[PDB]
Every structure is written in C-alpha cells, then in structure tokens.
Design an enzyme around this catalytic site. Structure first.
Site, PDB file in Angstrom:
ATOM      1  N   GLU A  34      45.477  43.094  45.171  1.00  0.00           N
ATOM      2  CA  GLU A  34      45.200  42.024  45.075  1.00  0.00           C
ATOM      3  C   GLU A  34      44.135  41.514  43.950  1.00  0.00           C
ATOM      4  OE1 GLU A  34      42.360  40.645  46.923  1.00  0.00           O
ATOM      5  OE2 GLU A  34      41.862  42.102  47.399  1.00  0.00           O
ATOM      6  N   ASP A  36      43.078  45.669  49.693  1.00  0.00           N
ATOM      7  CA  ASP A  36      42.391  44.653  49.573  1.00  0.00           C
ATOM      8  C   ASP A  36      40.679  45.226  49.015  1.00  0.00           C
ATOM      9  OD1 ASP A  36      43.288  42.916  50.550  1.00  0.00           O
ATOM     10  OD2 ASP A  36      42.908  42.934  52.451  1.00  0.00           O
TER      11      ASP A  36
HETATM   12  O1  LIG Z   1      36.870  40.568  51.782  1.00  0.00           O
HETATM   13  C1  LIG Z   1      36.128  39.834  50.371  1.00  0.00           C
HETATM   14  C2  LIG Z   1      37.581  38.693  49.019  1.00  0.00           C
HETATM   15  O2  LIG Z   1      38.348  40.038  49.661  1.00  0.00           O
HETATM   16  C3  LIG Z   1      39.855  39.238  49.240  1.00  0.00           C
HETATM   17  O3  LIG Z   1      41.313  40.971  48.857  1.00  0.00           O
HETATM   18  C4  LIG Z   1      40.730  37.573  50.012  1.00  0.00           C
HETATM   19  O4  LIG Z   1      41.565  37.916  49.648  1.00  0.00           O
HETATM   20  C5  LIG Z   1      38.885  37.028  50.418  1.00  0.00           C
HETATM   21  O5  LIG Z   1      40.180  36.076  50.923  1.00  0.00           O
HETATM   22  C6  LIG Z   1      38.289  37.568  50.740  1.00  0.00           C
HETATM   23  O6  LIG Z   1      37.145  36.975  50.731  1.00  0.00           O
END
Ligand SMILES: OC[C@H]1O[C@@H](O)[C@H](O)[C@@H](O)[C@@H]1O
Length: 504
Positions: A232, A192
């Site tokens: 992502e 992430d």
């Molecule tokens: O951590 C901040 C953001 O990171 C992304 O990877 C997530 O999918 C979001 O849902 C989140 O708000």
C-alpha cells in the site's frame, strides 16, 4: 490472487460487533457477491488511536472480537486478506519496554531503529532533510534506554517505533506474524508501511533498493507459506508505475479521483490515458477506510514541477467539487491545508462525494470492475452510505465520517434500496461471467465516449461510458451502457439500476 470481488470491512462495524457476526452477514446476505474479504486489523487492541493500525500485540486477536479460529472458520468459504504491519510497533509492546528497562543489556535492543543505527558518523542537514515524511517534523523522538536519553526513529507517531527489519529479532517478530497468518489460512497479505521499512543513509529512506530487497525477501517467505503480497503506497503516479513493476501487486489509487473528475466534467481523455498506462497487477477500489487520496493524481510532493494526469487547477476544482456536492461536510471532516495541492486526503464517503447520485455511482463501479485488476468494495459503499456526522462529532476523528457502525437491522434496511441491489447484481455479474478471465481491449473517441471490452471463451462483454449525456448532482440520465454475449446470446442494458444485468 482470485479474480472474484472482495469486500473490505471492520469486524465490529458490520453486524453485531464480532468476527463471527461479520462472517454471518457475509454468508447470509452477500453470497456469490463477495467471494473474498479484507478484514481490517482485529489485533490487540482494535479501538486505539488509529483504529487498529497501532496494535499493542499484533499476534493476538482482540478477545472482544474473537479468536484465530474464527478466522480459520471463515477461510473454508471465503478467501481472506489480512494486514501485516511490518515497519513499526507499540512503544507499549513488551519488546520495547524491555529495551527501555535494560537498555543495551538485552535482548530486543537491536530490534529497534535509532538515529545512530542509520547514521553512525553524523548526519548532514541534507541527510535528514531529504527523508520522505507522511507526517511533519523529523522522524525522531525522545525515549530513555535504561537511563540514557535516545532518539528513536519514528515514521508516523512517537507511539509507533520503527523496527530494524534486517535484524534477527525484527525478522523473528515479522515471522511470528506470518506463521500465525498461515496457520489460520489467510490467502493474501497487505504489507503496511512497507515503503518506509528500509533505512539507508543519504537516501529518502522511501522505496529505495534496500526496500525492494526487503519486499522480495518477504515475498519468497510468503510463497513458502501460501501467502501473496500486496503493498500500500500513496505517491506520485509515475513512482507508482515504477514500483508496480518490481512487486507482485499494488493498489490502483488514481481511478477513484479520476472518476470523480469525469463525472464532474465529462472529459474522458485522462482515463483513456490511465487505461493505456496503468499497471494491471492491481487491486481496484473506489472507497477505502481512509479518505479519498488526491495526492495520487496530483503534482509531486517534493517537486511541484512534475504534473499529474490533470492540471493543478483541476485538482483544486476536484477537492472543491467534493466540498460542494456534500454541502460542506467534507470541510467539517477534512482539516484545512491552506491550499488544496497540499492535501493528502479528502475525508467523505464516495456516495456523498457524488451528491448521493445513483447513476454516477453505479457507472463508477462498472468502470472499476471493467478494468484489469481484482476489485474490492468497502462496506460503507457496499451499503451506499452517507456521511456520518454524529460519530464525527463524537470522536472528532475526521476519518470516522466514512466509518459507520452498521447493526444488522441497518444492513437489512439499506439492503432494500435499488442502488444497493444494482451493485450486488453487478458484482455477481462480474463473478459469474467467465469473460473476465479472458482478454481486455478498449476504445475511445476523444472526450465524449470510452468503451471497455472483455472477451473470454464462452462469453463477451462491453461497457460504454459517456458522462456528457447527463451532468450535475441531481441528473438521472444513465451515463453507462452495457452489452454482452453468453449461453443465451447477445443481450443489452441501457440502465444499470432499474434493469440490472443477469447471466445464463
Ligand atoms: O499505520 C499508519 C497508517 O498506515 C497505513 O498503512 C494505513 O492504511 C493507515 O490507515 C494508517 O493510519
């Protein structure tokens, strides 16, 4: 990564409110349907600002939800995908609090990025201006180290502080997370904010070389523990195809809005285009736990000249076709941007976005499952759920419109609906027929028709897709036909809700 359908869910929003209750519902009511699952962040806490993505301690399960042993229990039947937040952490983490108190003196001080960390000789206007921003302003905020006032790098909120990933404490920390991930037998890791994870002066600090370097470093560290990596990234689609080449897997974020368009209009070229050009090391989705991203198929954020897979007017007519089909609920939930090419996401469920039309929905799922990549389904769409206005009005949090707390009663009550049974049947079909472990071919007419073909060893299948054949939110005419070959020969389905497909 296994080619079975995965389910995406919160632990607390499916069943009684726990990891075990989640595992119960998954095993008893979904067997053979979802053979794998993605569990949204269950760490300490889960009920914060951003619903799990702002943990205070990443390493520990929220004791209201469970423990690591519940994870490990679930590993025996199901493959498991979990989140690793590699870019940042809580300013209320002990590490950062320690830097706050002792300043430079110790020991976590290097773990954390500041403006000086990246820009030791000053930064130009162009230095700072060129940085890619998911959020407004500069990626800096004020905090005090021992007594001295410092600008600390922040990508998203001032509360989530960015770690220097090339440092030893930062890397030591990420590896504490992987070690715990592998111990409880996680298969698949979602990395992430990894796009934002590497900062170098003079760059956009987003998907640069140093970042690929970091990803490949994390890849090798994962395979060492038996963990496959998934990034992502919401961005301009050509950058997506660019990125996708140099990593193991990525999301397919174009398809959901593309299908909204095609079901809205009946123009399929854009999709034959995407089929030709899309990266096939993918995870496919329709709904996720964030909103429907329109930025993916649109014009680029920084340079409006790079045009997507449709004109800017067709993106406008998409944001507004959603707004219309839900009769203003997405307006309530989506904060206004003054224009629609400035939107990231349109907050709504993917059932509601179709005007709770069953034929259109099931066709969309069919196409998702026919294209190359491993498919995922989100609980709310697994339950074909509608926009929840109560929570939205309870929390004022836009995304909560698409996150409904489902008790078991509601699950077994929504389980009775024919569209839910058709979806279940269709996943099972996608899982049991071996034609999908095979080879993919497609054909198109011009606009009216597209046909998706898979051919495997003992079996074959073809899905033909014609959105022209019926139009409008209340239109009950099937827009997808299915044919296939198995032990029992050549079979057909012209309606996928009423006459759902089975295997021999
Ligand atoms: O951590 C901040 C953001 O990171 C992304 O990877 C997530 O999918 C979001 O849902 C989140 O708000």
């Amino acid at each position: 990564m296994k080619n079975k359908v995965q389910l995406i869910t919160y632990a607390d929003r499916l069943g009684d409110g726990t990891i075990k209750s989640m595992t119960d519902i998954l095993r008893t009511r979904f067997d053979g349907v979802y053979d794998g699952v993605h569990i949204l962040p269950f760490f300490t806490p889960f009920d914060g600002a951003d619903a799990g993505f702002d943990p205070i301690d990443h390493t520990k399960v929220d004791e209201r939800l469970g423990s690591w042993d519940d994870v490990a229990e679930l590993s025996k039947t199901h493959n498991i995908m979990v989140d690793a937040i590699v870019n940042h952490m809580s300013w209320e983490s002990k590490q950062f609090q320690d830097v706050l108190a002792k300043g430079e003196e110790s020991e976590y001080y290097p773990m954390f990025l500041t403006m000086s960390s990246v820009f030791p000789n000053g930064a130009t206007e162009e230095d700072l201006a060129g940085i890619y921003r998911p959020r407004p302003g500069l990626p800096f905020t004020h905090y005090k180290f021992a007594g001295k006032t410092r600008l600390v790098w922040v990508s998203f909120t001032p509360q989530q502080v960015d770690i220097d990933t090339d440092s030893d404490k930062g890397w030591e920390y990420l590896m504490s997370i992987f070690d715990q991930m592998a111990a409880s037998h996680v298969s698949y890791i979602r990395l992430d904010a990894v796009g934002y994870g590497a900062k170098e002066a003079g760059t956009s600090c987003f998907m640069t070389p140093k970042t690929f370097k970091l990803i490949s470093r994390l890849r090798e560290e994962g395979v060492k523990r038996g963990l496959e990596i998934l990034i992502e990234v919401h961005s301009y689609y050509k950058k997506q195809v660019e990125i996708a080449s140099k990593v193991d897997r990525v999301y397919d974020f174009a398809l959901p809005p593309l299908l909204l368009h095609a079901l809205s209009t009946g123009h399929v070229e854009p999709v034959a285009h995407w089929t030709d050009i899309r990266p096939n090391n993918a995870v496919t989705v329709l709904d996720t736990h964030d909103g429907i991203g329109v930025i993916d198929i649109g014009s680029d954020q920084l340079d409006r000249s790079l045009k997507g897979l449709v004109p800017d007017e067709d993106v406008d007519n998409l944001v507004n076709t959603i707004h219309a089909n839900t009769h203003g609920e997405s307006q309530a939930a989506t904060g206004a941007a003054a224009s629609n090419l400035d939107l990231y996401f349109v907050n709504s469920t993917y059932y509601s976005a179709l005007g709770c039309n069953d034929q259109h929905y099931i066709a969309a799922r069919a196409v998702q499952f026919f294209l190359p990549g491993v498919p995922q389904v989100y609980y709310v769409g697994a339950l074909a759920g509608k926009n929840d206005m109560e929570l939205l009005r309870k929390t004022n949090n836009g995304r909560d419109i698409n996150r409904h707390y489902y008790s078991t009663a509601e699950i077994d009550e929504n389980l009775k609906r024919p569209v839910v049974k058709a979806l279940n049947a269709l996943a099972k079909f996608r899982n049991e027929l071996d034609a999908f472990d095979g080879t993919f071919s497609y054909t198109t007419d011009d606009d009216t028709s597209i046909s998706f073909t898979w051919r495997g060893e003992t079996s074959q299948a073809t899905l033909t897709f014609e959105p022209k054949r019926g139009l409008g939110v209340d239109n009950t005419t099937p827009v997808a036909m299915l044919e296939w070959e198995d032990s029992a020969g050549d079979h057909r389905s012209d309606d996928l809700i009423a006459n759902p497909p089975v295997v021999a």
